[PDB]
């Protein structure tokens, strides 16, 4: 009874950051050999569980999340980090117990002219609670006068596009991130 780990990592497409997919894994036998013993994983770094100790344990629930971020924002997917994505898009609890996987996907997710299908949230009233997401796209209120749904002075759109092209350097190249969690 192998786990669908093959489907999560080899999915045809990953959702945007502000609408990260979440899949429930239970009642299965998990094999982490193919994950750690693969050179395609640029970053396999995690907290509270050593990677070699993964296969000798039992869990009650496995949660897998996925999205696509830039190369320079990978350091922000970690507990106790402050930044644009952590404060506004995807926040982890300080006592996080799970392994984060990310790798380059320039050849897949980036197209000449701009892949404007990837977005991120930039404006919000307050920071996000851990493992909490909001897909609401209401116009942001930044000034005193109510916006009433018209863009203009202090009424910017809360979403912006990364716009991947294969011309940028490694810093801006698309990365696909998988964030496993255990409990």
């Amino acid at each position, epitope marked *: 009874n192998l786990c669908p780990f093959g489907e999560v990592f080899n999915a*045809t497409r990953f*959702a*945007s950051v502000y*609408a990260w997919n979440r899949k429930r894994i239970s009642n299965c036998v998990a094999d982490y050999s193919v994950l750690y013993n693969s050179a395609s994983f640029s970053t396999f770094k995690c907290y509270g569980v050593s990677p070699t100790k993964l296969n000798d344990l039992c869990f009650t629930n496995v949660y897998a999340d996925s999205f696509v971020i830039r190369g320079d924002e990978v350091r922000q997917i970690a507990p106790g980090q402050t930044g644009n994505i952590a404060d506004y898009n995807y926040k982890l609890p300080d006592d996080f117990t799970g392994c984060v996987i990310a790798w380059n996907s320039n050849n*897949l997710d980036s197209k000449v002219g701009g892949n404007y299908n990837y977005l991120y949230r930039l404006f919000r009233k307050s920071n996000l609670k851990p493992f909490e997401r909001d897909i609401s796209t209401e116009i942001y209120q930044a000034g005193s006068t109510p916006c009433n749904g018209v*863009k203009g002075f202090n009424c910017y759109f809360p979403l912006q*596009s990364y716009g991947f092209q*294969p011309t940028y350097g490694v810093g801006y190249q698309p990365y696909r991130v998988v964030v496993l969690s255990f409990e």
Partner: antibody
Amino acid sequence: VQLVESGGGLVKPGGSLRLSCAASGFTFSNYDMNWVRQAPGKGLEWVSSISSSSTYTHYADSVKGRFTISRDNAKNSLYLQMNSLRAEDTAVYYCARDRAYRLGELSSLWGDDAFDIWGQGTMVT
Amino acid sequence: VWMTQSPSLLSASTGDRVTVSCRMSQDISSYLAWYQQKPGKAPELLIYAAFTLQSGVPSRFSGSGSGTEFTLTISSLQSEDFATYYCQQYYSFPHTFGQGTKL
């Protein structure tokens, strides 16, 4: 980036016709191409598709197995062989380009664009 | 996936805030576009990826909503903005268009 079309016209039922969609200033040979039609007084309905490398082609459902799409990267021309026509197919046909590139012609990963530029249409009867 | 707009005859005065919805069946995230076809002419590309603006169009046209709902909001109707508006998903590979919204 000016798309021009030709062909079609008056034809007997059950006949065969071949259309042309030419490129006049861009790199067509490595863009994809798509065909969209509309009936008089109706909406738009998807018809066909073709990759830039001419390896992957997808057709519609109501016309599956009866149309053939082909392209020539040398002369920057696109064709659609249609045969065994009915009275339903009488409509206006546009050839639609795609917004953005993709270097790797991978299966189930092409043709996710938004039809950046269209043509002027014809009068297929 | 099957597209479903539910205006069919919506018409307003010169200058308003109309909202054309576009109901769907599955979840496609942000893979939905918008078109604008004047009578007897080829359609012109409008908001694509449900959030971007094609170069050239004014800022009075907006695209919002996420998940299985998408709406196009016009800030102020003018004489130029009187035509049909279609939907188009490109998640799977049937390309299901819309039905039509005559302003």
